[PDB]
Amino acid sequence: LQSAIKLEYARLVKLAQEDTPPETDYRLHHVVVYFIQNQAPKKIIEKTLLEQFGDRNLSFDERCHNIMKVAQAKLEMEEVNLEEYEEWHQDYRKFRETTMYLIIGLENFQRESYIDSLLFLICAYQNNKELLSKGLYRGHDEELISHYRRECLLKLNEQAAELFESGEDREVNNGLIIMNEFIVPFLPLLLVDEMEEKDILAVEDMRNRWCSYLGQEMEPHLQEKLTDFLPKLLDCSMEIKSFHEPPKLPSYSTHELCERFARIMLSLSR
Numbered sequence: 001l002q003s004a005i006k007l008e009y010a011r012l013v014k015l016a017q018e019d020t021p022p023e024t025d026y027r028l029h030h031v032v033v034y035f036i037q038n039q040a041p042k043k044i045i046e047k048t049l050l051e052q053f054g055d056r057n058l059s060f061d062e063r064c065h066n067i068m069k070v071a072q073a074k075l076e077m078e079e080v081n082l083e084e085y086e087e088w089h090q091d092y093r094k095f096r097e098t099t100m101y102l103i104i105g106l107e108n109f110q111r112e113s114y115i116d117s118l119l120f121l122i123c124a125y126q127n128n129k130e131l132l133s134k135g136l137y138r139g140h141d142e143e144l145i146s147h148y149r150r151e152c153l154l155k156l157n158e159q160a161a162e163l164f165e166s167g168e169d170r171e172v173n174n175g176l177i178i179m180n181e182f183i184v185p186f187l188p189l190l191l192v193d194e195m196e197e198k199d200i201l202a203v204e205d206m207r208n209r210w211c212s213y214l215g216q217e218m219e220p221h222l223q224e225k226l227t228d229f230l231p232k233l234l235d236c237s238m239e240i241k242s243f244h245e246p247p248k249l250p251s252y253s254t255h256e257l258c259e260r261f262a263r264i265m266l267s268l269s270r
């Protein structure tokens with residue numbers, strides 16, 4: 001059947017146009033769905049379909065063997081544009097990893113493991129902005145990732161402040177280590193854009209919280225600690241390293257990707 005590829009392409013177009021609830025994202029099921037929703041050239045899509053049919057070497061199924069030879073025939077026929085071809089498949093692999101960062105970030109947020117959550121959400125947010133640079137359908141819901149990155153910062157800040165309010169030397173030092181390790185270094189990320197008003201207000205809310213302890217009386221060696229810390233939190237400088245190493249992802253199957261995405265989207269309460 002010289003048209004099995006045309007049948008399959010027409011099926012994926014239909015899948016690509018279906019309206020689906022937030023837990024279901026057929027871009028995670030097939031690279032060609034990602035391509036269709038992102039206006040990939042018809043030729044990029046056909047080559048991807050032909051290679052999915054024609055890449056194998058062996059078959060025990062007469063009908064599939066024949067479809068394999070047909071696809072290998074068309075593929076063997078300047079029109080290749082390999083850099084464009086590799087670029088689209090790299091973009092899809094980045095979409096899958098971005099999804100996996102987001103899932104682990106949201107899973108840990110829901111478990112209230114905010115230290116583990118935060119870096120995944122920050123990485124997901126930044127990768128997602130890089131995807132959406134290239135088009136509207138390249139990535140994930142910006143307002144959702146924006147919401148959880150911001151709420152995860154505020155909850156970790158709450159955790160650090162309540163440690164500080166306890167007034168014990170170990171807990172104060174631990175709270176200040178949280179602020180200096182996980183929060184202060186990423187404050188510039190939430191100030192980059194004046195249009196992102198909720199992020200601006202959240203940075204101001206975190207800064208007010210730590211300043212309001214000036215209005216409280218406490219052990220003076222702790223007051224010296226607060227006094228050295230506050231300039232760090234209130235600093236005007238936007239100095240931030242340009243590359244950050246991403247947290248480690250455990251190996252995962254596409255099956256895991258899709259199912260864990262569905263499961264966290266369905267249990268999240270926002």
Ligand SMILES: [Cl-]
Nearest residue numbers: 019020021022
């Ligand atoms: Cl949708």
Ligand SMILES: [Cl-]
Nearest residue numbers: 020021022024
């Ligand atoms: Cl959806």
